[PDB]
Design an enzyme around this catalytic site. Structure first.
Site, PDB file in Angstrom:
ATOM      1  N   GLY A  63      77.261  -4.528  49.019  1.00 50.49           N
ATOM      2  CA  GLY A  63      77.664  -3.335  49.743  1.00 50.49           C
ATOM      3  C   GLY A  63      78.350  -3.644  51.057  1.00 50.49           C
ATOM      4  N   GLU A 101      76.050  -8.792  42.963  1.00 52.37           N
ATOM      5  CA  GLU A 101      75.365  -7.807  42.131  1.00 52.37           C
ATOM      6  C   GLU A 101      74.995  -8.387  40.772  1.00 52.37           C
ATOM      7  OE1 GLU A 101      77.342  -7.284  44.332  1.00 52.37           O
ATOM      8  OE2 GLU A 101      76.935  -5.392  45.365  1.00 52.37           O
ATOM      9  N   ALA A 140      72.931  -2.690  49.857  1.00 52.80           N
ATOM     10  CA  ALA A 140      71.841  -1.734  49.743  1.00 52.80           C
ATOM     11  C   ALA A 140      70.496  -2.453  49.738  1.00 52.80           C
ATOM     12  CB  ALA A 140      71.990  -0.897  48.474  1.00 52.80           C
ATOM     13  N   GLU A 157      81.813  -4.024  50.226  1.00 54.13           N
ATOM     14  CA  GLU A 157      82.363  -2.718  49.880  1.00 54.13           C
ATOM     15  C   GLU A 157      82.542  -1.856  51.121  1.00 54.13           C
ATOM     16  OE1 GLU A 157      79.222  -1.891  47.088  1.00 54.13           O
ATOM     17  OE2 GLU A 157      80.625  -1.915  45.400  1.00 54.13           O
TER      18      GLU A 157
HETATM   19  C1  LIG Z   1      75.514  -1.902  43.619  1.00 48.03           C
HETATM   20  C2  LIG Z   1      75.685  -1.933  45.114  1.00 48.03           C
HETATM   21  O1  LIG Z   1      76.765  -1.863  45.574  1.00 48.03           O
HETATM   22  C3  LIG Z   1      74.456  -2.098  45.979  1.00 48.03           C
HETATM   23  C4  LIG Z   1      74.344  -3.555  46.357  1.00 48.03           C
HETATM   24  O2  LIG Z   1      75.015  -3.937  47.204  1.00 48.03           O
HETATM   25  S1  LIG Z   1      73.224  -4.727  45.581  1.00 48.03           S
HETATM   26  C5  LIG Z   1      72.953  -6.041  46.799  1.00 48.03           C
HETATM   27  C6  LIG Z   1      73.886  -7.183  46.506  1.00 48.03           C
HETATM   28  N1  LIG Z   1      73.696  -8.051  47.639  1.00 48.03           N
HETATM   29  C7  LIG Z   1      72.672  -9.079  47.623  1.00 48.03           C
HETATM   30  O3  LIG Z   1      72.019  -9.224  46.668  1.00 48.03           O
HETATM   31  C8  LIG Z   1      72.476  -9.980  48.831  1.00 48.03           C
HETATM   32  C9  LIG Z   1      71.017 -10.268  49.215  1.00 48.03           C
HETATM   33  N2  LIG Z   1      70.654 -11.430  48.470  1.00 48.03           N
HETATM   34  C10 LIG Z   1      70.320 -12.759  48.938  1.00 48.03           C
HETATM   35  O4  LIG Z   1      70.099 -13.491  48.046  1.00 48.03           O
HETATM   36  C11 LIG Z   1      70.167 -13.372  50.344  1.00 48.03           C
HETATM   37  O5  LIG Z   1      69.322 -12.560  51.082  1.00 48.03           O
HETATM   38  C12 LIG Z   1      71.448 -13.873  51.078  1.00 48.03           C
HETATM   39  C13 LIG Z   1      72.380 -14.496  50.042  1.00 48.03           C
HETATM   40  C14 LIG Z   1      72.195 -12.766  51.836  1.00 48.03           C
HETATM   41  C15 LIG Z   1      71.157 -15.084  51.995  1.00 48.03           C
HETATM   42  O6  LIG Z   1      70.159 -14.790  52.917  1.00 48.03           O
HETATM   43  P1  LIG Z   1      68.962 -15.847  53.347  1.00 48.03           P
HETATM   44  O7  LIG Z   1      68.740 -15.809  54.827  1.00 48.03           O
HETATM   45  O8  LIG Z   1      69.180 -17.243  52.888  1.00 48.03           O
HETATM   46  O9  LIG Z   1      67.579 -15.367  52.615  1.00 48.03           O
HETATM   47  P2  LIG Z   1      66.523 -14.181  52.978  1.00 48.03           P
HETATM   48  O10 LIG Z   1      65.311 -14.879  53.514  1.00 48.03           O
HETATM   49  O11 LIG Z   1      66.212 -13.619  51.632  1.00 48.03           O
HETATM   50  O12 LIG Z   1      67.029 -12.967  53.972  1.00 48.03           O
HETATM   51  C16 LIG Z   1      66.270 -12.376  55.009  1.00 48.03           C
HETATM   52  C17 LIG Z   1      65.544 -11.080  54.621  1.00 48.03           C
HETATM   53  O13 LIG Z   1      66.440  -9.898  54.238  1.00 48.03           O
HETATM   54  C18 LIG Z   1      66.007  -9.482  53.091  1.00 48.03           C
HETATM   55  N3  LIG Z   1      67.200  -9.109  52.390  1.00 48.03           N
HETATM   56  C19 LIG Z   1      68.271  -9.814  52.267  1.00 48.03           C
HETATM   57  N4  LIG Z   1      69.156  -9.174  51.561  1.00 48.03           N
HETATM   58  C20 LIG Z   1      68.641  -8.014  51.203  1.00 48.03           C
HETATM   59  C21 LIG Z   1      69.063  -6.903  50.466  1.00 48.03           C
HETATM   60  N5  LIG Z   1      70.342  -6.746  49.847  1.00 48.03           N
HETATM   61  N6  LIG Z   1      68.232  -5.924  50.353  1.00 48.03           N
HETATM   62  C22 LIG Z   1      67.046  -5.967  50.887  1.00 48.03           C
HETATM   63  N7  LIG Z   1      66.596  -6.950  51.577  1.00 48.03           N
HETATM   64  C23 LIG Z   1      67.384  -7.981  51.742  1.00 48.03           C
HETATM   65  C24 LIG Z   1      65.214 -10.745  52.470  1.00 48.03           C
HETATM   66  O14 LIG Z   1      64.438 -10.359  51.382  1.00 48.03           O
HETATM   67  C25 LIG Z   1      64.531 -11.195  53.453  1.00 48.03           C
HETATM   68  O15 LIG Z   1      63.542 -10.272  53.746  1.00 48.03           O
HETATM   69  P3  LIG Z   1      61.985 -10.721  53.953  1.00 48.03           P
HETATM   70  O16 LIG Z   1      61.633 -10.757  55.408  1.00 48.03           O
HETATM   71  O17 LIG Z   1      61.113  -9.724  53.271  1.00 48.03           O
HETATM   72  O18 LIG Z   1      61.779 -12.086  53.374  1.00 48.03           O
END
Ligand SMILES: CC(=O)CC(=O)SCCNC(=O)CCNC(=O)[C@H](O)C(C)(C)COP(=O)(O)OP(=O)(O)OC[C@H]1O[C@@H](n2cnc3c(N)ncnc32)[C@H](O)[C@@H]1OP(=O)(O)O
Ligand SMILES: CC(=O)CC(=O)SCCNC(=O)CCNC(=O)[C@H](O)C(C)(C)COP(=O)(O)OP(=O)(O)OC[C@H]1O[C@@H](n2cnc3c(N)ncnc32)[C@H](O)[C@@H]1OP(=O)(O)O
Ligand SMILES: CC(=O)CC(=O)SCCNC(=O)CCNC(=O)[C@H](O)C(C)(C)COP(=O)(O)OP(=O)(O)OC[C@H]1O[C@@H](n2cnc3c(N)ncnc32)[C@H](O)[C@@H]1OP(=O)(O)O
Ligand SMILES: CC(=O)CC(=O)SCCNC(=O)CCNC(=O)[C@H](O)C(C)(C)COP(=O)(O)OP(=O)(O)OC[C@H]1O[C@@H](n2cnc3c(N)ncnc32)[C@H](O)[C@@H]1OP(=O)(O)O
Ligand SMILES: CC(=O)CC(=O)SCCNC(=O)CCNC(=O)[C@H](O)C(C)(C)COP(=O)(O)OP(=O)(O)OC[C@H]1O[C@@H](n2cnc3c(N)ncnc32)[C@H](O)[C@@H]1OP(=O)(O)O
Ligand SMILES: CC(=O)CC(=O)SCCNC(=O)CCNC(=O)[C@H](O)C(C)(C)COP(=O)(O)OP(=O)(O)OC[C@H]1O[C@@H](n2cnc3c(N)ncnc32)[C@H](O)[C@@H]1OP(=O)(O)O
Ligand SMILES: [Mg+2]
Ligand SMILES: [Mg+2]
Lengths: 260, 260, 260, 260, 260, 260
Positions: free
Chosen positions: D111, D134, D68, D114
């Site tokens: 997600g 998460e 998400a 999931e």
């Molecule tokens: C409860 C639920 O079921 C709902 C959920 O899923 S909660 C989400 C759980 N998933 C996450 O947290 C994963 C996302 N977290 C991250 O740390 C990393 O992005 C990653 C581990 C996937 C590795 O990616 P990375 O290429 O090294 O870094 P990153 O530069 O941050 O990614 C590219 C872009 O996508 C965005 N992005 C990545 N994951 C995102 C997410 N889940 N939501 C929104 N934006 C996201 C980044 O912020 C970044 O955007 P910007 O242009 O604004 O900088």
């Protein structure tokens, strides 16, 4: 709106109750596909309305709902049934998070009874009758006529009604636990609207949480159900309505819920 | 015993019954933390005595138990509720292996009704009243008010009581299935103690096995429940009380169980 | 055939009802091994008859069934019970696909009551009495006495009966939901046969499907139970009896089912 | 269609497969409300076409789906989530009657995992990674990340991934039972489309029935599951594809299913 | 400390990990009543301590735990087992809200395996061995040996281990799903402590919520489990750690959780 | 006896193993009515024999069992299937209280696989192949092919096997959890007989109790499963084999179980 099978209106003081009356006197409120679609539309409209806190479902004085339209399902095939999922449209009341009260007057046979069983509270008239005559037409109850009925009135009476199609009066339904209250035929809808008002007078979020906790009783074991109830009770502390109610209890006055 | 909220004493001929009477007429027997701790202590003291075979839980003639203390949970946050595991002590009553009879007199509202529902047998007075007014204070039941109630009075009446808080009469509670006997207000406790005596006069191990087999009905399917019941029936043959009772029946005499 | 403990015959006009009467007045219809074997033989005979659509199980006017033969289980050991899998012969009734109506007259104690609880519909006489005296002999029910009874009459009354062995009248059984109808002691069997006739007058395959759907209510959750019920409803469309009944309804005539 | 977040197209020879590729390389295929709406629309479109028998869900070679959009749920409150039901639209995948194959390449976190777990078959690339981060953002999975993952890989690895967010390789996902087949990055989609073709080449009705029977394994006990499977097997005989295939096998020839 | 059967220490940077090491090498860490009491005391101490976020359970280098004390249970009887409810104190591990990691080194037989199966995560050594030799001494497992093992390694391997008593290597447990990681015998405890630190680095309330959501997978159906997971996900928004982490990520910085 | 489709014999030293080999190379051991009847007769014979402690089910070197006889079910209709309760004779294998080991060699497709899945332990040859080709003929499994397979190898692989009819090797079946050991084609039966001997060398009553406890894992929740396991563990103390084995262990000698 321009509903040709149902009449949806905002009744009750402050327009807090939603009344959906099935209007098909020529077919005893036969639950046809169009009628089900109109009922679902009315339920969606009332659910998305912030003023309506409860819904009341009722029919005519002679018949609440005679069940599915046998004329339509006559030529249906097994392939058609399995492909179209005929009765999937019917399980929309189960998704309505707002409480729904069924004012059953007259014949509540087959699907109609099942419809009444899909609601949270059932108010039956003095001359109301409940039956599952599907067995008389070479069919079985397929929209909750055996599960909810068996869970409510027990195995013996449920089996009897399902295998013989005999009818039970409002008194028998109340004694077995199918209906909670019996009211006169002329004042049934009024008492149902009064109960809907009493319900809607409380916080809607807590009402929905309580509805979910009660529904969980038929889906989980007693221990897991109690744990889910505890989790919901803990979550209620995050809302402002809980604090307001507890302060209005401690300080001697009435509570003013903001639905949050 | 130095109890300030309850009175625990041995009653019945041969002192085989344990009576715990909630004593807090100034708060209608509000179930505070200290009161629940004293109740658990009394239960553990009666659950370890080789003479007490059954326990009787009662309150005042005006109110059995008004429920949890709102004044204590008023300034309570969700974080506190989750961290402290609030209301855990209340479940200790379900761990007692000995049968507990609830003599409900007067008001049994909220946490009180749940308490009565946590016992095995419930005897209600002619003027006793049950209700779940949690919705009126912006909260929901959290100790089985929506799980045990729904599994005894049906979906309709349980939903009505939980969403409106209306009080039900002892006759209604018996017709629905919440209580088993309606005793006079002046003889409720005496008949409850007599029933506790009748229960304690049997083999304690077999009584506990039967209690467990009955409780299993709300936690397992009918097939697995029946299999567990049959396994417990087989296990009962390892005790000497079964052989003693069967030989006394075949010989037309009285059985002297040894609780083993 | 030559039966020493029971009498099996074909009753009802057109010979459509199967009547099995337990005949052991000197032991009040004690459920011994031979009696259960003959009962299973009669049930198998009636289930394999294309003319019998329903079975009626009854006993004597003084006692329907007192329970298992204590004289046979007196000297039974734990190892013997577990090696022989005692009481499994009793579960054969639960495998009968055709509906079985229990006409209970007089005493229905212990296993006897369980027997009546294993049937689909229970008809009790005005003087009929139900009880679970197992606790009085140092044992517990082992054929659903704590599982079906608890689901039928609730936790309170079931616990009371199982822990005290007290008897409940036919009126109490009906008020609690254990029995469906009360008939005079002189016409109980006749009314049971009349109801079995109405049951058998319908499509046997559809009757079996409805019986399975109703039984599923005690083995699955509400969601999965409703889904299985919907699947069975869709499957009913493959039979010709469904189309025949629907056409008869549309044509306003009597439906001539052919069991297919 | 004018989709801006996804690309939906017919793939496979005879256009028997549907391919939905998430197109948002600027947010690693973040599952926003608009993307979910487009995905649901594409699914509904492919689920109503009599030519498409299977659907293939895929993303980019660098990331399947990052979950998400955290930037959208940042300011959401408890009341907002409870009232709007944030993650409700995601469950549409569970209502798809036709089989869905998940082609996972690169990051499948939160997600995105999931979502992949909501599909029936999961094909992962040689360098694909699954995780539940998460916990690292102060929340827990809310779309089945703790139910399906635990049932698939077990308690130990599920707990580890959920409490630490550590990533698992496609090899460790197949060894644990989450992934069924590992394919090269540049050939994952083609092999997934070939599997979807193999699936769609069969009778769609029997395919959906088998999918439902397999899904039932996680919703009911083994006994009721086997009974439902037997009922579905009996129902399959009502279709023409069953007899057609059986005769083609008995005659040693090819079967021409017509989806009926 | 004054303990004599176990060693309880606070390990890891900032003293955030709780290490409980069984120190009974003269009996292969036989799980006696005193050892279990000391283990429960240490677990309660580490749970009440706010600085400890995770717990690590380990034993000796030659054996983690050989199970219950055969010498103490030799002269026990069925009546004593039923009256004292033997092995109930072992279930305390299932009530610990904080995550527990089991570092299994050497022999983990009988209860020692069950204990390891009671923890959330299991780290096994290269020479670790898991077995259920209860059948070799005329008894079956009694602390989840047949329930948790079957739900992880499958019916076949569980049946084989339970009926034959054969041992499985650490690699077999890793490939089956009983253990999540294999580490050298010299660094097993260190890697377990590192994992415990990584777990404790997150908010404790959300960690407990996630642990509960994961445990929920083995108690309810998939639908009710997913609903409980979604409700817990909604509830997590009432905490401050969720918003803190989401803002720290949106601002591209590290989150500082305060466990609230 | 004179079996025309199977060969039943007493193998293993002391004649403690029961080997049933399906002899029908012309139809690849197609499971027909007569073959299933002979298999049930042999199973009952080996279960009633006091010397046989375990049973070993095997087929040919080329194919274990190719499934049901499509030649017979070709002309079967829905009404026939429902009235006759088709395939119920296959469930008798699950009623065998003694352990059964399935030695699978070559093709184990459809019903055969289900047969292998109906046993407790499955030993597969190096060239054994498991598949569910019911989808390739227009039907679905009807003897637990979707329930046990899904519970064993997970959803992702079970869905693929059921919707594509693909074959998995013994290595994949062992990695997923369907089989517990892989043996050469020439020594499979010998190792199976050795495992059967190892199993039969223990107390038969305790072995049956352990089998029941393990099977309970797929029919009840984790909490109720653990409680039933505790009850069975308490009951084992009533047998003499428990005391004998425990004394032999405490005295460092070989136990001489008396099967009681
Ligand atoms: C409860 C639920 O079921 C709902 C959920 O899923 S909660 C989400 C759980 N998933 C996450 O947290 C994963 C996302 N977290 C991250 O740390 C990393 O992005 C990653 C581990 C996937 C590795 O990616 P990375 O290429 O090294 O870094 P990153 O530069 O941050 O990614 C590219 C872009 O996508 C965005 N992005 C990545 N994951 C995102 C997410 N889940 N939501 C929104 N934006 C996201 C980044 O912020 C970044 O955007 P910007 O242009 O604004 O900088
Ligand atoms: C899938 C499900 O779960 C539900 C089902 O299968 S349907 C099972 C429940 N419903 C039924 O069996 C049908 C009702 N059966 C009856 O016998 C009756 O009509 C009744 C007992 C309700 C009332 O009887 P009544 O007072 O004599 O009035 P009656 O003349 O029969 O009905 C008036 C009109 O409603 C129609 N009607 C009644 N029930 C109907 C139904 N379920 N579907 C369609 N039309 C129906 C009648 O056919 C009749 O229409 P016409 O003008 O064309 O003659
Ligand atoms: C699941 C849980 O565990 C959570 C819960 O149960 S929440 C509690 C739900 N139960 C209730 O709300 C019932 C209490 N509500 C009431 O409206 C009323 O007190 C009553 C109907 C029981 C009695 O009505 P009444 O005859 O007019 O007597 P009333 O004057 O109100 O009460 C007497 C005293 O007990 C106190 N009291 C009554 N119920 C109480 C309660 N649940 N908690 C705390 N104090 C309570 C009153 O505040 C009052 O105290 P003061 O002397 O300081 O004024
Ligand atoms: C679940 C299971 O499968 C296990 C079980 O059910 S355990 C059996 C539970 N049943 C009982 O305990 C029996 C109830 N107790 C009784 O005392 C009485 O027999 C009764 C109340 C049924 C009848 O009372 P009554 O009118 O005074 O007649 P009574 O003289 O006692 O009995 C008539 C005969 O039937 C026998 N009998 C009655 N119930 C019997 C039983 N359950 N088993 C064997 N014999 C029984 C009597 O012993 C007596 O036979 P004799 O000629 O040898 O004296
Ligand atoms: C609650 C449950 O579900 C569990 C249960 O009920 S029963 C426990 C089931 N577990 C067992 O049976 C395992 C014990 N059985 C064994 O065969 C072996 O002890 C073993 C294979 C673990 C070790 O083999 P080993 O290396 O040769 O060492 P060994 O000499 O036997 O044991 C060292 C001492 O520990 C004692 N010991 C070992 N296991 C023990 C146990 N489970 N309980 C009590 N004492 C034990 C031995 O008696 C032994 O002798 P002394 O103390 O008198 O000197
Ligand atoms: C109850 C259930 O859940 C099971 C079911 O519903 S349906 C049964 C599902 N199982 C199957 O479909 C597998 C059988 N299908 C096959 O295609 C193949 O026989 C096979 C894949 C096993 C490979 O076999 P093969 O090496 O090519 O040799 P093949 O020539 O086909 O078979 C040898 C003989 O066995 C017969 N046979 C094979 N499987 C059979 C089956 N399931 N039923 C009846 N006969 C079968 C063949 O028809 C052939 O007999 P003929 O002498 O008349 O030619
Ligand atoms: Mg009732
Ligand atoms: Mg696995």
């Amino acid at each position: 709106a321009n509903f040709e099978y149902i009449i949806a209106e905002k009744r009750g003081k402050n327009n807090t109750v939603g009344l959906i009356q099935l209007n098909r006197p020529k077919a005893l409120n036969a639950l046809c596909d169009g009628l089900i679609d109109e009922l679902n539309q009315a339920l969606k409209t009332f659910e998305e309305d912030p003023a309506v806190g409860a819904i009341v479902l009722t029919g005519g004085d002679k018949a609440f709902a005679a069940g599915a339209d046998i004329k339509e399902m006559q030529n249906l095939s097994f392939q058609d049934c399995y492909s179209s999922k005929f009765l999937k449209h019917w399980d929309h009341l189960t998704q309505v998070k707002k409480p729904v009260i069924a004012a059953v007057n007259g014949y509540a046979f087959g699907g109609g009874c099942e419809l009444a069983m899909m609601c949270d509270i059932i108010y039956a008239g003095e001359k109301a009758q409940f039956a599952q005559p599907e067995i008389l037409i070479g069919t079985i109850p397929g929209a909750g006529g055996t599960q909810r009925l068996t869970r409510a009135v027990g195995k013996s009476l449920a089996m009897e009604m399902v295998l013989t199609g005999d009818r039970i009066s409002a008194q028998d339904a109340k004694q077995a636990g199918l209906v909670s209250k019996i009211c006169p035929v002329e004042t049934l809808v009024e008492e149902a609207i009064q109960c809907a008002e009493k319900i809607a007078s409380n916080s809607k979020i807590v009402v929905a949480m309580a509805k979910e906790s009660v529904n969980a009783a038929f889906e989980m074991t007693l221990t897991e159900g109690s744990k889910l109830e505890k989790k919901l009770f803990y979550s209620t502390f995050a809302t402002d309505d809980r604090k307001e109610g507890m302060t209005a209890f401690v300080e001697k006055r009435k509570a003013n819920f903001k639905d949050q």
